[model samples]
Target: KSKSHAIEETKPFSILLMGVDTGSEHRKSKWSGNSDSMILVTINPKTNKTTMTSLERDVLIKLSGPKNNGQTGVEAKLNAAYASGGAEMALMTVQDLLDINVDYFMQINMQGLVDLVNAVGGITVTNKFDFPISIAANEPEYKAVVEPGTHKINGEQALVYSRMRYDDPEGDYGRQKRQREVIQKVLKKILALNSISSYKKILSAVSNNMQTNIEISSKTIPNLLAYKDSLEHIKSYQLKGEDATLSDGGSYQILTKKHLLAVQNRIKKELDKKRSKTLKTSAILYEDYYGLEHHHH
Candidate 1:
C-alpha cells in the first residue's frame, strides 16, 4: 500500500460523499445498501473555495470484483460497487472511473438525511412543478405536496422532494438535479446558522446517522472550521451523460470516455491552480517573516 500523507491544514483534498439507500423504513445499523447518491467535493483551503460534482447513480461503469478479476470489464450501474462490496469497493470503483484520488468519504443513510435536514431547522427549495408526490401507505408521512414555487420544507418533505424522480419530466436527470439542490440548500442553511445550539444539533445528526473514515473531531472538525467562511463560495457541477436503457432490461446513463477524460483534466487543472496559488502565498509569508538576505549564501 502507498503511504498516505499526514493531515495538514493547508492541503487540498477530495471527499466522496455517499448517500446509501436502505430499502427498509428504518435506518440500518450496517450500511448494506446501494448508493443512490454520490457527490465528489474538492476543497482548497488556500483558495477558500469548494467544488462539488454530482455523479448520477445510473451511470454505467465497469464493475470491479474478485469474481471478474481477469476477464474483460463487466459493465454495471455506478452504484453496484456499494451493494457488491462496501465503502472500500465503492471508493476504488469511483477512483478508477474518475481517474482521481479520493482522500476521504462520508457515508450517510437515507433516513439520516431526513434527520440532518430537520436538525438544520428545515430547508427551503423552489419546486419546478406544481404536483404531488407519494410514498407507500406505510410511509404516508414521507409523501410531499409541493406547489410550483418557493416553499419551506421539513425533513420528511425534503426527503420526498429529493426522491421525486417519477413525477419529474427529466426523470433521473431531474432527480439528480433536485438532490444537488437540496444538498446545497442544506449546506447553506447549516453555514448560515449562528448559534452553538444549531451546530450541536447538526453534530448530533451526523454522529447518529453517518459513518466516515476520517477522524471527525481531530481532522474534519478543524478543517471545517478553517473553511467555514470559504464554504460560502461553492461551485456545483454535474456529470453529463447520454440517457439510455440497457440492452438486458434496465435504464442507465451512458457516459463517453472522452467526456470523462475532459472532466478529469478540468478538475485537475483547477486543483493545481489552487495549490499553486497557496504555495505562492506561503512563500510570500516566509519571505516576510525572514528577510530575503537571510537566505543568501
Candidate 2:
C-alpha cells in the first residue's frame, strides 16, 4: 500500500518474487497451497541492470524456520514454506537455502496474476513455436494455443502461460521458460505504459496484483525511468543444466556439486562487479550532496 515497501535503497538489495499456486480460485485464501514459480531479482543502481535467477520450486534446499508457531526445522520442499507462513517464511527459507541476505520480497497470488494481466489491458507475448496444451497425459485437454508470433493476451490466458507444465516436452524446464516470457511481456507493457490513461491502469494493476517489501521513493521513479531506454540493450542468461534435478517427491530441484559451484562462482562474479560500481557511485553522490559540510559518525 505504501512506497516504503519497495527496497531500492537497501544496498545490494535483492527481491525474491514468487507466484504461488493455491489450487483453485476457491483454494486461494490465506496461503492454502504452495508456490510453483520463483525468481530471485537483484537490482543494482550502479550497474543499472537487473539480474533474474529463476529457481525451480522443486529445488532440494533446506526450508528454515517454524512454519506455524512450531519448532523450526529443515524441510525438503521449497514451496511448502509459502503454504505454511505466507510470504514471510518463504523468503526466509530461500535466503537460508542460498546463504544470502535477502532484503525484501514480492509475491503474487495466482488470482492476483489473473487480475494483473487484465488490469494492464492485457499483455503481449511472443510465441517461439506452436504447441498443444496438456496438464495431463494420455487423456489431455488441448486448451488454447499460441500462434508463432506476437499475441496480445488477457489475464486468464496469461495465467495459462504461467501454468503450462504438462504441455512442455521437457516438463518443468519448459514451464520456467514460459514463465520468463510472460514476465518479460508484462515488463514491456509496464515500461511502455507512460501515457496518463495507461499509467492509471498500470497503477491499478500494481495495487491489485503486486505485494512488495521494497521501499520506493520519488528519487527512485525518475532514476529508473531515465534509465528505462537501456532495457533494450540488456542481455539475458540462465544458470541451468543437467544436474539440477528434481527432488522431494518431484517437488523441487537440486543442483549437482559441479553445477552448484559453477553457479555460485558466476553469481559472485556478477555481484562483485555490480556491488563495486554501486559503492563507487554512492560515494560520489554523497560527496556532491554533503561535501565537507557533513562528517561521518
Candidate 3:
C-alpha cells in the first residue's frame, strides 16, 4: 500500500481531478476527449492546510509502451495519454511522473462545469486582469468580460475564465493558475453553503456529468463536513518550466529533472514528513518495480 492510502485510513489523501471537454451532450463513451485540465489535490483532516498542484497540459513524457501505437518509446505531451490510452494510462503516466499514487480520479466535462456553477447559484473569483473570453470557440467575441477584482460569475463565465489563457502573458500556465484559483473559490462557496439541499444539487450535477472510481456513499457527507475545515486554508503551486517549440513548430514545456525533483520532494514533505525523499531514489524504485522506460526526447 502507498503512503497516501495508509494515511487516508485515518487522516488525509490525494485526488486527481481531470477536466475533459467531451462535447455539449455529455456523452459517456471511451476517454476520447482531451484532458484539457489536470489538478492534483491533497487534503489533510488533521492539518489546517490543503494543497492543490496544477499539472500543465503540455508536459512532455515518453509513452508507457505500445498502448496508442507500437511506438511505446516515442515522446508525447501528458494530455495525449488520455486521448491515446484513456484514464488508466493517464493515471499511470501521472504516477510515473510524480512518483506518488493517486487514490481516486474525478472527471468532469464542460457541460457539467456549467451546471455545477449554476447549481451553486453562482461563484465569486478574483480577477487579476481584464480579459474577454468565450465558453466555446466560434461564439461571439467578448461574450464575457472578466474584469479586474472580485465579481459574481455564472457557470459559462467560469468556464471562460478557466479557459482563457492564450491572451495572458503567462499563456497556458496562467490558465492553470486561474483554474486553481477558481477551484479554491468554489470549494469555499460549497462549504459556506453547507446544506443538504445544496449538496444534493451539487451531487446531482456531479452524477450527471462525472465518472470516477471513488465511491460516494452516505458516509461521504460527514467526511466532507469534517474535511471542510482544512480546505479553508489552501496553498496553490504551479510547476515551473521553460517552453520549447517542436520540429513541427508545436509548443511544449520542458520541465527539468531538478525542478520536478524539488516539487516531488516538497509535496511529500508538506503532506507527510516521513514521506520526504529525493526523486532520484523514488525514480530508481519506480523503474525497478514498474519499468515505464521514461526518457527525454
TM-score of each: 0.81, 0.71, 0.83
For model 3, state the Cα shift of residue 80 in Å.
0.7
Q: Is 1 or 2 the stronger prediction by lDDT?
A: 1
Please state the error at residue 269 of candidate 3 in Å. Answer: 2.5
Clash totals, every prediction: 0, 12, 0
User: After superposition, which runs of candidate 3 have C-alpha atoms over 4 Å from their true positions?
Assistant: 1-8, 25-31, 65-73, 135-150, 273-297
* C-alpha lDDT values of all predictions: 0.70, 0.58, 0.70
Candidate 2: list runs displaced more than 4 Å: 1-12, 23-32, 67-71, 126-130, 134-150, 195-200, 216-252, 268-297
lDDT leaderboard ranking: 3, 1, 2
Residue-level lDDT for 115 in candidate 3: 75
Error of 1 at 94 (Å): 0.3
Instruction: Please state every model's RMSD to the true fold in angstroms.
Output: 12.2, 11.5, 5.2
On residues 164-225, what C-alpha lDDT tens digit does candidate 1 reach at each position?
Answer: 77676787778888888888888889988955567767877768678886665644455556
Give me the displacement of residue 223 in model 1, in angstroms: 3.2
**C-alpha-based local distance difference test score of model 1:** 0.70
Q: TM-score: which is higher, 1 or 3?
A: 3
